[PDB]
């Protein structure tokens, strides 16, 4: 940012601290698993946030580890096109630690726009039993 000078605005006498719950990786061939964290402001209000963890997919970025393998560059990620691909070679096969001869694969080296700070958004995202109602 061209801004700079961030860190949000503080309130002395706070009702409580963020409270985390644990994670529920929720599986299913992978499945994006969420964690949700809430607080009370400082006037005492149910604050809540949201984040997504990391599921242990099969077959990872370990192209090797007893076997051999190496990465090769024919060409640095394109900005123009907004990709990047990198070619990889088997280098040595085990008897019992056997490996793929070649691989090609081409990522999406840019990305969307991702904004960070999420607005206000729908309050009513999820249902819940507001007590009292409004205290009235």
Same mark, same amino acid.
């Given at each position: 940012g061209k801004k700079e000078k961030p860190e949000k605005k503080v309130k002395k006498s706070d009702c409580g601290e963020w409270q985390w719950s644990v994670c529920?990786?929720? =599986? $299913?061939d992978c499945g994006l698993g969420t964690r949700e964290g809430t607080r009370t402001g400082a006037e005492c209000k149910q604050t809540m946030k949201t984040q997504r963890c990391k599921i242990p997919c099969?077959? +990872? +970025?370990?192209? $090797?580890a007893e076997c051999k393998y190496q990465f090769q560059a024919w $060409?640095?990620?394109?900005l123009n096109t907004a990709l990047k691909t990198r070619t990889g070679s088997l280098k040595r096969a085990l008897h019992n630690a056997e490996c793929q001869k070649t691989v090609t694969i081409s990522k999406p080296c840019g990305k969307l726009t991702k904004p960070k700070p999420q607005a206000? =958004? +729908?309050? +009513?995202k999820k249902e819940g039993k507001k007590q009292e109602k409004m205290l009235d």
């Open positions: 529920v990786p929720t =599986s $299913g099969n077959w +990872k +970025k370990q192209f $090797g $060409g640095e990620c394109d206000e =958004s +729908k309050k +009513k």
